[PDB]
Structures are given as C-alpha cells and as structure tokens.
Amino acid sequence: VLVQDLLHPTAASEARKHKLKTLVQGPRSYFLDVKCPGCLNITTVFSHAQTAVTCESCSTILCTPTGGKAKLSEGTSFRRK
Amino acid sequence: STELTVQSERAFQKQPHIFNNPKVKTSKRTKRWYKNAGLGFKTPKTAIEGSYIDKKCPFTGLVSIRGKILTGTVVSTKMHRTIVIRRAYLHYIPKYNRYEKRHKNVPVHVSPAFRVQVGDIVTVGQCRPISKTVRFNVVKVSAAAGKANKQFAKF
C-alpha cells in the first residue's frame, strides 16, 4: 500500500467490492431472455425479479421471488442480455 | 373600489378645496386631484382612477413622502387601511464575531390604491406622523405571486 492507482484499479478488485463502493457505482443485476417449452414467446425478466412473472401462453407461473436473484422455474431456458 | 358606500362615514368624504362645480357639466363630471410621490415611485392607475378619498394616501391625500425608505414583508392585514410589516435583520455581536436574528414590527398605512396580503413585500416611505405608531406609507408593492394561488386542489 501507501502508493496505489486509485483511478485504474483491478477488475477483480471491483468485482469483489460492493456495488455502491466501486469507483463508479452501478448495478450488478441483469436482464434475461426467457423461453418456456409451452410456446415460442420470449419473455424479458429481471434477475432479481421480486415478482412471479408469467408468460402470455404459460399464464400461470414462470419464476419465484427470493431474497436476491429470482429462482427461475426448472422447466425453463434463459439467456443473458 | 367603486362600490360599497365610498361615503360610508358620518361625514362627506372628499378631497379638500377640489371643487366639482355643479353649474358646469363636463364629460367626466368629477375632478380628482393626485400627485406623484417622487423618488422614482409611480402613481398607480388605481389611485388615478379610483373613487376613494383617503386623506392619508401618498398619492391622493395630503401626506408627503420624505426621509427613510424601508422594505418588509406583510404579517398583519387585520385593521382598516393599516398593515404591519416585519423587518428581519441580523445583528452583529463583535465578541463572538457572529450574528443573531432580530426583527422589528413596523405599522404602516396602506392606501386603497394598493392590495396587500400577508406575505407580500412592500416598500414604505417615511411621512409625517399619521397615528400613534404609524410613520410610513406603502409606496410600492413588490409582490408578483404571493404564494397563495398555487396551493389549490388539483383536478
């Protein structure tokens, strides 16, 4: 220590640090394109959904809220971004 | 204003030595004296075209503006033709090189040529003693909004 590059820190270090405690704060959540076997529709969901989003065809349940990231259903495929 | 018994008193209210000769009838049929208060203040069109008498008016009365010019916010409009302004200021205390808030309440005569409400800012000019406590006349109302017409319910 006692001499550091505060402007250009390590990507592993920022990945370790808290989301509010980086050099520039930003979200670590993300959005998922979600596909259920019922139909060919694509549903955009939030990683930390905090709701039980439902598909237009499979209009009962798609995900279950949890403390952090939403628990996607076992009969479901997903893709980041 | 024009209505509600301008002659509401036991005596006839009129500007002294301003004769409205009844023999000759002009178009206006009445004569109203007025003056500019000076010092850059302008006589309002309400004073020019009003019906009130108000012998203490800085524009249509017999009083004159001379001496100090003060500014303040209105805190009381409860008595007839007189308001109370609040002059807030900071008093320096040299030992602590600091300030303390202080205020004075100035009773000031308001001409019916002006409409004031609590919260308005007015400039007042010193005049001869008008009452026991009043020594100033409202000469300008520096009020644009008043913070009253924007608090209503929203539809």
Next chain:
Amino acid sequence: TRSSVLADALNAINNAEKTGKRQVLIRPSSKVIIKFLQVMQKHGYIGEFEYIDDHRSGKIVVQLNGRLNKCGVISPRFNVKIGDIEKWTANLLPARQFGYVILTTSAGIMDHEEARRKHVSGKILGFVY
C-alpha cells in the same frame, strides 16, 4: 449528516498526508473543492488531481507530493474585512513567509496574498501550509 463537503475533503486529504499516502479519494467533490485544490496546486502543495464523473456528484483523486503539512476549513465562513486578514494569517499560519489562508471573495476564490494584491476581501474558507 454531511454539512461541509469541503471539510470532509480537507480532512481526508490531511489524514492521507499524515499516514504517508501518495493519493487520496474525495467525495462528493463540489466545485468549491475543485477551486480549493486548484489554489493549493498552484502553490505546489498537491499534484495532479482527477475528477471522476459519476452521474450523481463526482469524485476527486488527488496525488499527494508530501509537501503539505496541514489543510483544513475554517467553519463557519466568517466575513473578513481588509484589516482582519492580517489577524487571520497571524492566527492560522506557521510563519509570515509561507502558507496561505484561502478566501472566497466576490472576485473569486483566491489566497490571501492574491487578495491583498487585488485589494479584495470576502469570507474565510480554509488554510494550507
């Protein structure tokens, strides 16, 4: 709650200087802070500093060259006449030959030598020596 981001800035710089750090992070980094840093940078007490543009308030990374003894705010910001600048410099500065009392005058934020050259006065902001 925060009441003087300038005070937090100068306290953080002072603590890094005391601990021997060569760089310090400052938040939220107002433009009064930026002017204070430019004055001490002009006189050489700090090096390059960097404004981080987050979309909320900004940050500053200041490079420290070990030449700073102490910097801090004078809170509250007393009004100072022309003749009380000498009293403030006598009270706050280690010597009459170096060190600066920072003023916020109508002509802008400057050091007391510049204020005396300009024959201007204002409020007292802080000091550096």
Next chain:
Amino acid sequence: GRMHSAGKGISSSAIPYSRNAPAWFKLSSESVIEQIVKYARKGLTPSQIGVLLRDAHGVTQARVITGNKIMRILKSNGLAPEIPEDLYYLIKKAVSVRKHLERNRKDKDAKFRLILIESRIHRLARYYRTVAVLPPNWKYESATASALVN
C-alpha cells in the same frame, strides 16, 4: 439514517451511469406510456407500476426510456391521486396500528410505534404543504384518517 431507529443499513439501488439505456430495448416510449396509463387505470401505484414494468418487460428506468417519471406521466394523464403514495401508505400503517391498539390496551410497544408513525406522517405532510402538493391547512386528524385511507 433510519430517522426513527438506530439502524445504519445502506441497501440502495445503484442506477446505471448510462442515461440512455440499454441498447437492446425495442419497444416504443409511447407504448411504454400506454402501458403505464393502463396500469394506473387498473389501479396500481407508481412504485409498483415501475416494479412490474421492470419485471415483466425490459424497461429498466422509465425515466430513461421515456422522457419523464411515472408520477409525472400519470399527472399529465389525469391519474394523480388525491394524496401522494408515501403519505398514503404511512396513513394506512397508522390506521392498522390504531385498529390493533383499540383492542390491545396493554401493547405499549404499539403505542410507541404509533407515535413514531404519526410523527413521520406529520413531518411528511408538512413537507407536502410547503411544496404545495397538499392544500394548506390539510391535516392528519387521526379521526378522519380511516376515511382518508378507506
């Protein structure tokens, strides 16, 4: 923080730096506006409208995809409530606590919490009256509170 507690938790949301997000959203800002309006007519508050929008759709920040905030859009579309959401929910909590207290005389913890909730209500109501969101001499009376909240 925690004006009526000793807690010091942070637990905030960190909105992205990019004010023009997210380079993969394709729905029109106008279509977002009809979605907001139809949810308001369904009877949803702005916060949960934004929650369900962000959840079941790709709209990350409505103030980013659309040019205005949710409450601003609803006010522009004539759907603003008589009282704001946060004040409404504080009043609802106070009504719940009072209903509990009227039958639980010995719940002194509930009495303490009721006092703290009512003081929060009064502070927020004062702010809203100064910012003219509420009419002047609007008052939380604790007698018409249940009427105010229904």
Next chain:
Amino acid sequence: GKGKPRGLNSARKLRVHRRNNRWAENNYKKRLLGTAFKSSPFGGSSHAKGIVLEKLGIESKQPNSAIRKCVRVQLIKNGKKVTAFVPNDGCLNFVDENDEVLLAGFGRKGKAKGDIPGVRFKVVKVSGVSLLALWKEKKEKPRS
C-alpha cells in the same frame, strides 16, 4: 464537535450560554447579587467603626496552641456584631471595654486568616489613636 454551536447566526445562543454559566464564578455572582451591600458586616467598605462589647480569648487552631486576644464589637453604622483580632504583643490592654475602635479586614476578602478561627477583622485604631502608635509609644491613649 466541541459541544457548542458554531454557525454564524448562533451569537444569541453563545451570549446567553456565557451569561448563564457566568453565574458559577464567585466574583461575578457577588457583583451581580450585591452581596457586599446586602450580606456583609461592612457596607462594602474597607474600614468600619465599632464599640467594643467584650474581650475574648480565642483558642488557636491546630497545630498551634495560643490565646488570640480578640474583641467582640458592635458596628455603629448597622449594629452588626463582629469579632476583631487585636494584633501585637499586648495591645489588648490598650483596647478596654466600651471603647471605640476602627476595623479593617485581614486581607483575604472574608476568609479568616491563619490559625484564628472565624475572625475576619482586625483593629487598626482605638479611641481615635492608631494601635501601632500606641504599641510603639509614639502616642498615648486619650482619657475620653
């Protein structure tokens, strides 16, 4: 920090706090209450005259053993009774009873001096003649 207000507009608070805590000083409290005028054997005076009521032998405080040869006198101007020490070898034979004496303090603004308990005054003159002059035999005590 420091537990006192610092804002530019806190002068009223600072002045009032100083006024309130000023009452914990001794001299300020005496000046403001007028204790010397109200509760003090002298009326704030340096000296006072009195009529000797009696001669007293006051025992010395530890670790001293002595009889201090004081006098109980009544002041002319207010009728208060005080005890005055008669300072020198002898000089108690110069005082007598019913005589008129002049009294000063010891020098501790109250606060009985030395090993003499509860005695705050000393005799300067008797019958209009300085006690030092009577002790040095420069003068003689008048018959009257």
Next chain:
RNA sequence: AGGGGAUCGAAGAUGAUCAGAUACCGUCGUAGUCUUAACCAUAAACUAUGCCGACUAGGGAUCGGGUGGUGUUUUUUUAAUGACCCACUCGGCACCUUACGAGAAAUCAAAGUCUUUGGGUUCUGGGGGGAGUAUGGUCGCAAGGCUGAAACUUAAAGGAAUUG
C-alpha cells in the same frame, strides 16, 4: 381497591453468639412477592463514554441477509432445497495485537484525525462543604419527584499511578 396468596420474606417473634446484639447465623412469620384497574417516575436507569456525518490499523471469529463455486452431504448412490466448506460483500453484538495518534495515567480503533487549536448540534460543570438543604412554584392520595439558593465555613477535598 378487587382477586390470588405455593415459595421466599422489610416489620415482628424466637433460639443462639456477644460485654452488650432490638445485627450477622437458625426456625417461624404480617405487609410484599403474582394478577386486574389505577397511581408513582426513581436506580451504580452504567459503556459511569450525548446524537448525526467523514477519515485514519493489522487480524481471527460470530449473528442476519445476499452473491459465486475444476466444492461436499441424506435422499434420484449424478434434482430445486435444507445442512456444511471455500471466496466475497452489506449490516450488527463483540473480541486479539500494536498504538504511528491521544491521554495525568489507568487506558482508548476511539477517549485518534486538538496551541498545526473551527464538520453540525443538544445537555451539563467551574476548589471542598453548607446542600440537592431553605424558600417559592409545580406535580403526587401519600411516600416523594421536578425546579432550586443564600448566610456562613474551610486549604485543601479529589484523580491516576510509585515505593513501603
């Protein structure tokens, strides 16, 4: 004031001890202890450390939540889960080392960022006693609480540590 009232136990009784013991000890035992409806508002109510905010040091733990795994585990001897392990992270009760710093010192991660003295703000103190007394006010059914002097008196009282 009503109910309850096992136990223990201000008062009291009583046996010891003792010079005396209306103390300690032993055996009983009213009020209390429990409860309801009302009062009271005081504790060494103590961390004897006001509250809010920022920064400064090196670790191992632990509680709650969350994130991740060339991880394991009772189920399918290769499933969410739950339970453990590892790496983090936010918040919390705290600990260990040392103080670079502070302090009169004991000690303190705050009691640091203080003659290089200014982040915001509330309350309290001004040698020891008299005295939290007197009086006035106010609250209480009372016990008492809150507010709260003066005369006078006195050279120390007091803190931490050292040696005996």
Next chain:
RNA sequence: GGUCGGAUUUCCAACGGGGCCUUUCCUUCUGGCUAACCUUGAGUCCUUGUGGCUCUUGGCGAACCAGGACUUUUACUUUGAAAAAAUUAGAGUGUUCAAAGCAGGCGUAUUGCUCGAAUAUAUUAGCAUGGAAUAAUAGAAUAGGACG
C-alpha cells in the same frame, strides 16, 4: 558609459486593471456638441525603419437630460462623505530638564521680518459606491408562460 557598487528601457519578466470577439445584454424612443468614425468629389512639402496627418458633407451616435413600452429581494465585501472639542497615538518647539504648554524663532533693535498651532484612529447602524465567489430567495407544469 568621455556619466566613478552611485540617478536605465515601447526588443520585456511577474503582477494589479479596463475594453472587444468567441452562440455572450446595454428591453427601448425622445436631439443634438455630427459613435475610441467600417464613406477619401478635394488634399496637406518635416529629401528612404514604425505611432506631432489640415476645411473631413450627410451617412445605424450606448463615453448624456426625465417623461415611462423601467427595474426579483437580500446577506456579504470594496471605496467614499460625515462621525464636536478635550482625552488617546503622534510631528515640531531647550518650559533651565521634565510633567506640561502651544508656544516661539531670527535681524545691525535705525520705530521689524517670520515658522507654527500638523497628521492618524475613532467601531454598529444609516447614506452613497465597485464586485457578484460564498449563503439564502423567485420564476414556465391543468401554461393563467415569453417575444411583435
């Protein structure tokens, strides 16, 4: 540099200023002293570095006088006018010295000349006055908004 470390300078160093341009307010007429002249029908000789260019026809005049198509409000800070004398600080003056005082000094004394009796400060508030960093305040959200 004939001027024995002794009195320098538009080739400038760093300052303290003002003005103009860069998307840059000075809201706008009233009559003329012809904008720090964006017009050379004329024309002024100092015999070859570069600031001492005459009668300038008008010609888009903010460096100027109160009538209102005239004013967001302060805190703060600069400068200035005044703020009795005495007292205070302080200049001069051999009261024999001094405290003081405001006197005195110089001619050939032939009938006289002359220095003075300074200066500074005296707060807050008020009054003008340059500045617009710091701190507060106001504006256009059901447009009852601005510009002609």
Next chain:
RNA sequence: AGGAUAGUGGCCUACCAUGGUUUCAACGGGUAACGGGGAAUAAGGGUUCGAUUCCGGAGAGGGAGCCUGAGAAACGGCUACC
C-alpha cells in the same frame, strides 16, 4: 370627524372596527442605573469602570397648578396641600 396645540399625533372627545406586543423574550421584577465623549488594564480577543472638568437629560424638601414673558410648568417667581 371634531376639539385642543405653535404645529403632526388617541394628544383628547364622539361614533365605529377588534385590533396591538410576545420564547428573535413581550409583560413584570431588580439595579448599591443618569446616557455619552471617555478611564484602568490590556499579544490578539477581551474584562472592569464612567456621581465628577465637555456634550445631552433631569431636578431644586415632596407633589400639583399657574402668572409674566420670545423663551419657564422657573422655584435666589407665585399659589395650594404635605
């Protein structure tokens, strides 16, 4: 609105309205309080004093009333009461 005053003014009167001040400390109590120029001390900031040579106010044993006069509610003027 009038009266009175040298004159403004609840200064007073008639009628009317219900106002005015206040924790930014009103109102009340105390002052061994006349205010100031100033004085003592004083690194800076301050603390204390100012009955008393100059300025302003007030009073002439205590109150009140008044005459004469440009000017007095005078007291080395008057009148009454104490």
